[PDB]
């Protein structure tokens with residue numbers, strides 16, 4: 001009824017928002033700064049207080065000390081090296097050698113110790129964040145879930161049942177099978193359930209251009225790993241990071257093997273990782289090096305194969321629990337139609353079988369819609385199917 | 395003019411730079427030959443276009 | 444700026460009137476609320492007084508820096524352009540949220556303290572691999588296929604335009620789409636009509652140009668590529684001719700196939716990684732479907748497998764009609780003799796014959812295209 005009367009009384013106050021919010025001050029869209037209404041702590045005091053008494057305190061690196069006296073030996077980025085001193089504010093206790101310290105530009109004396117270098121590409125592969133994958137969602141391989149989970153979390157959640165019994169729990173475990181079987185998807189439930197540092201590693205990210213370059217990245221990874229008390233290190237697709245040593249004639253695949261040898265050394269030998277648990281997963285395990293496959297590094301050895309019948313029916317009940325369907329279908333018929341089949345294929349059949357109901361104008365799929373999925377996904381894509389030379393893992 | 399050269403030549407040297415591009419509030423981003431980039435100002439006698 | 448997200452009556456109602464009237468009174472409250480602050484606290488201008496107080500803090504030689512760590516109590520280690528890094532402190536006008544390792548910041552000339560942060564001048568490659576405009580005409584340009592086009596809209600376009608249908612079904616769209624057949628069968632040509640149709644950020648990459656001469660530069664290029672694809676929007680990543688990573692060996696690659704392998708491994712991660720993927724679609728196309736690794740082709744990585752057959756002859760006449768649509772055809776010709784000339788001609792062949800025939804007319808300055816133009820034209824196009 002009041003067509004313009006709602007529109008302009010709308011519009012003059014939608015504008016009058018901005019017409020006084022410019023008179024507040026949010027404006028002068030910047031080049032990298034902050035809101036003018038926020039910074040006013042450093043306004044009259046820290047502008048000459050966090051600035052004018054404050055130094056630059058250029059950071060350095062300690063070489064070593066000497067006896068009887070401080071007479072410290074400093075080192076900087078490019079320039080020369082000095083004999084330097086502490087400040088009074090610090091003890092000479094935590095002034096150990098090979099340490100970064102904040103140092104004045106004039107007297108060249110030590111102010112505060114610093115943490116060492118972390119190499120932030122290693123920092124990036126800390127995940128910081130958990131996925132949503134439930135152990136309810138990897139149903140069908142519950143014995144593998146149990147046999148893994150009894151290794152992964154049970155000392156971390158209960159470090160007393162192993163101690164008072166008097167056994168040290170294992171540290172290493174690989175997971176392997178054909179692709180799409182639930183290896184990576186299974187790892188996501190661990191990264192879900194967990195709490196500590198979950199540092200993921202994909203081996204092809206270690207492929208470097210320089211020599212020894214990934215090998216130091218390994219070292220740093222174990223440095224910040226040894227900083228944390230308990231830490232879980234994830235290894236995905238480790239066939240890139242190493243099969244074995246086979247060298248003959250011109251040195252082929254030399255560079256990868258040395259990093260693999262560093263990975264051996266960081267795993268076993270001379271006061272090791274302690275409370276750092278590892279977890280590999282491959283596709284084809286047959287390529288892998290035997291000393292890598294030595295226990296003490298890769299103790300638990302979990303297989304992932306296809307489910308028998310009931311795990312498959314359970315996977316039907318996993319992906320199929322949340323879709324509009326005919327009420328009176330049965331899945332055991334479909335599992336009979338899927339002998340050699342992964343749960344990814346089961347999910348793909350679920351998602352295609354919905355699309356059949358999406359084809360004309362149906363809301364819920366039927367049994368024969370599922371049958372329309374079966375021949376296409378199973379039997380029409382049967383030229384590809386990707387599995388059988390991975391069943392033998394070649 | 396000629397006596398003035400004894401004085402004005404006491405002025406120090408002038409840097410040479412390289413514009414990447416300008417930003418807001420009469421400022422530009424300029425990098426030296428082998429020396430890092432700077433966000434600096436303009437004088438009044440220089441137009442932004 | 445994001446003051447009220449509610450529009451739901453969408454009529455002439457006292458609801459939508461009272462909305463604004465309420466927010467009218469609130470915005471007048473903000474106006475005369477701030478109005479008294481300068482009335483009884485002039486004391487400054489506050490529009491440039493505190494602002495040029497900040498600009499009187501920060502010096503004009505603003506050195507450009509780069510982060511490498513963060514200690515929360517407004518000081519950190521920051522790297523110089525020379526490399527000799529410091530341990531300066533950070534200001535209060537730095538709006539401490541846009542601070543990530545490796546970012547460009549603004550430093551003092553004197554104490555090199557963290558003045559401000561710097562917006563990053565994009566990336567040369569993002570624009571290079573980023574497709575700007577729609578290439579060409581719509582799906583009506585193609586003709587003859589009419590089935591898999593429904594497949595492509597099904598997996599791609601309909602998820603975009605109608606996100607109601609998957610939700611009433613209790614389902615998500617299929618992930619990976621692949622295209623394979625004989626060469627010159629319109630494989631790229633369909634993707635052009637997709638790039639016409641979509642509004643999403645579109646990326647296109649040949650499978651040939653993945654390979655490098657540096658070790659790991661391929662997989663690094665992959666990781667930053669999927670970084671670019673994820674960081675933008677509902678994006679469409681297209682790959683053409685992915686077999687070329689397996690077919691041809693080049694001596695620019697220092698590594699052999701056991702670097703190509705690692706490249707395909709990192710890509711193989713980026714299809715089916717444990718990380719939250721987001722809204723990126725993957726369209727692939729080649730002609731040698733039997734050659735590559737089937738591990739990339741597993742469901743979970745690719746859901747839809749789309750073959751392109753050779754054209755049948757009643758579709759051929761349609762393709763002739765398309766490639767002869769706007770041209771001044773002299774009526775000397777019969778297209779049906781042109782259909783059965785080759786039994787297995789492609790859609791590239793028809794357009795090659797048509798365009799080359801136009802070249803033959805432009806040899807003789809003519810405007811219409813006669814029969815012998817086609818007669819010697821197919822001699823040029825086919826037989827050599």
Ligand SMILES: Nc1ncnc2c1ncn2[C@@H]1O[C@H](COP(=O)(O)OP(=O)(O)OP(=O)(O)O)[C@@H](O)[C@H]1O
Pocket residue numbers: 137138139140141178179180181182183184185186187283304315318342343344347715743
């Ligand atoms: N037991 C299962 N239950 C439900 N879904 C499964 C199961 N196993 C696999 N899937 C499906 O397989 C897809 C891929 O899982 P995952 O990435 O773990 O495969 P994988 O075994 O790690 O092989 P690859 O390393 O090649 O990925 C997931 O999207 C998931 O839907």
Ligand SMILES: Nc1ncnc2c1ncn2[C@@H]1O[C@H](COP(=O)(O)OP(=O)(O)OP(=O)(O)O)[C@@H](O)[C@H]1O
Pocket residue numbers: 584585586587625626627628629630631632633730762765789790791792794
């Ligand atoms: N069905 C068709 N209708 C109209 N034109 C076609 C058809 N098929 C092919 N063409 C013409 O052939 C040209 C080649 O198309 P396109 O490159 O997409 O085929 P392709 O199979 O991708 O080729 P390649 O195998 O070399 O990648 C297109 O520009 C198109 O005009």
Ligand SMILES: [Mg+2]
Pocket residue numbers: 180183184185715
């Ligand atoms: Mg996986």
Ligand SMILES: [Mg+2]
Pocket residue numbers: 627628629630631632
């Ligand atoms: Mg093509």
